[PDB]
């Protein structure tokens, strides 16, 4: 899934001094990451998660139908528990509690 960015970044350490190889790897990383930037931009600009592949780090989860009436009354737990951060897919930039 989102592990590709980690592989490219790990791969890019060895070719950090090679101009052509670094240019190609940087171009590939830039184009590949564009979807992730789209998800992040929509999340921070409109507060909407769009792509249903569960790729994005901010995991909004659906309430089960069996508990719909319960969660509607106690909206605090809906808005505090059913939004999570998927730690596996985070880059080192976001590996900070305050961010």
């Amino acid at each position: 899934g989102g592990l590709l960015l980690q592989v490219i970044q790990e791969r890019m350490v060895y070719y950090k001094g090679d101009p052509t190889s670094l240019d190609f790897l940087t171009q590939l990383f830039d184009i590949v990451s564009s979807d992730y930037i789209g998800m992040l931009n929509q999340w921070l600009l409109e507060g909407v998660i769009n792509d249903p592949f569960d790729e994005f780090m901010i995991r909004e989860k659906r309430v089960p139908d069996s508990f719909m009436e319960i969660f509607q009354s106690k909206s605090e737990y809906y808005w505090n528990e059913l939004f999570l951060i998927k730690i596996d897919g985070l880059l080192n930039q976001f590996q900070n509690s305050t961010i």
């Binding site: 350490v13 060895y14 070719y15 950090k16 001094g17 190889s21």
Partner: protein, 79 residues
Amino acid sequence: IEPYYDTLQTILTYLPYTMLGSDSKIFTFSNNYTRLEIPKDINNSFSSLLREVFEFAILYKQLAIVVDRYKGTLVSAIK
């Protein structure tokens, strides 16, 4: 002079393949590409001349080995 002088244009046929650091029917590398054996049927003069020409082949082979070995292994940017 042909009747009175015996030695193996045939050299130039197989020389390009040796110059590019590759094995040849009449020239064979050995000992991890550190020495090159000049065959029999190459009299003194031609062998002495080739010993100068083959300096490029062995040196280039060593450089190619280094380049292929350390292509993406070294971490330091300078190297």
